[PDB]
Design a protein around this ligand. Structure first.
Ligand SMILES: *[C@@H]1[C@H](O)[C@@H](O)[C@H](O[C@@H]2OC[C@@H](O)[C@H](O)[C@H]2O)C[C@H]1O
Ligand code: NAG
Ligand code: NAG
Ligand code: K
Length: 321
């Protein structure tokens, strides 16, 4: 059995992966991306972000995003559409604009309406608002927060829901798995959106970790339940477990136990619907270009061969390997 077959057998909707357009000329890569025994879901890594979809005010370009959407439909894989509102990968007409609350609110609603309407009925989920919090649970500064204030959040959710009523709408963030101040602030964002009368369906827990910093399965379950108690679904959205290079048999074994605890916590939680890894092979991992000296974060190595973590994920979904 593959990862998605194992997930569906334990009542998850999917096991899936991110990818990106430049990777699709690598035929051995795409042959395994197309393996629906392992992958039942796809996330576009870059080509549905604001800089990729609205490069000048009022001009939309969907060619690259459409390539990823058509591959998912071609395979019968779910699509998580990613992402509408984020501090990172904005075009300079947004970051450098002369704005008022009124003019940036209109331009934000226009962006969301055009992009969500283009993909209407194709998106199982949208990551509507991404990374709105500092490490201490205060709001992250960005042009939306300094010009519109915290209202930018329910405005984005209400604009996405009017353009595609069938998409589940997620708030997505990292380091929520530790609970404490940041998780409490992500619960408060869920309550902000409900208080405003706007639709929110989900919280995405990105599940970025350094090897050996993942807590017990029962700890993870308690944090996931703190969100499902609000009446939202949860999912792990950008999972990777990074190693300070070079790897050893010890750190590859700890990486396997770490991925095993994360997927078991999702199996055990009612309302946790699925698991996405941030690409599937060390060959194309974002980690080395972001976390200096770290790498080998994924369940397949740079030769596209399975690592110990592949069997750890199967063990966390109750398969003997
Ligand atoms: C989670 C975030 O939501 C996601 O968009 C990030 O993807 C990376 O964004 C930066 C870009 O240069 C990389 O190619 C892409 O993988 C990863 C994480 O921050
Ligand atoms: C992968 O699947 C997509 C969609 O079905 C298809 O366009 C593509 O040609 C496939 N590629 C390979 C190498 O199997
Ligand atoms: C912007 O406008 C909306 C709607 O009137 C409001 O909720 C928000 O508080 C305003 N923000 C600022 C900082 O002026
Ligand atoms: K579950």
């Amino acid at each position: 059995v593959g990862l998605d077959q194992a997930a569906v057998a334990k009542g998850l909707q999917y096991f899936g992966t991110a990818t990106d357009n430049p990777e699709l000329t690598d035929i051995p890569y795409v042959t395994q991306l197309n393996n629906t025994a392992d992958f039942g879901q796809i996330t576009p890594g870059n080509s549905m972000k604001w800089d990729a979809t609205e490069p000048s005010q009022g001009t939309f370009t969907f060619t690259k995003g459409d390539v990823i959407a058509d591959l998912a439909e071609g395979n019968g894989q779910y699509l998580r559409c990613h992402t509408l509102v984020w501090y990172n990968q904005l075009p300079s007409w947004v970051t450098s604009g002369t704005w008022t609350n009124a003019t940036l609110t209109a331009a934000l609603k226009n962006h969301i309406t055009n992009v969500v309407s283009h993909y209407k009925g194709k998106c199982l989920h949208w990551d509507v608002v991404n990374e709105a919090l500092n490490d201490d649970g205060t709001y992250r500064t960005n042009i939306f927060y300094t010009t519109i204030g915290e209202a930018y959040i329910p405005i984005a959710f209400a604009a996405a829901a009017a353009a595609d009523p069938d998409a589940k709408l997620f708030y997505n963030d990292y380091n929520l798995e530790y609970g404490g101040a940041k998780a409490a602030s992500a619960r408060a964002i869920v309550q902000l959106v409900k208080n405003a009368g706007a639709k929110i369906d989900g919280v995405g827990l990105q599940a970025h970790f350094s090897v050996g910093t993942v807590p017990s399965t029962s700890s993870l379950v308690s944090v996931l339940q703190s969100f499902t108690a609000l009446g939202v679904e949860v999912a792990y959205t950008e999972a990777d477990v990074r190693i300070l290079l070079p790897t050893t048999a010890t750190t590859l074994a700890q990486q396997s136990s770490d991925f095993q605890a994360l997927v078991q916590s999702c199996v055990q939680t009612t309302g946790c619907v699925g698991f996405t890894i941030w690409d599937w092979t060390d060959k194309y991992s974002w980690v080395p270009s972001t976390f200096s000296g770290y790498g080998a974060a994924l369940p397949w190595d740079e030769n596209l061969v399975k690592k110990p973590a592949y069997n750890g994920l199967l063990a966390g979904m109750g398969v003997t390997v």
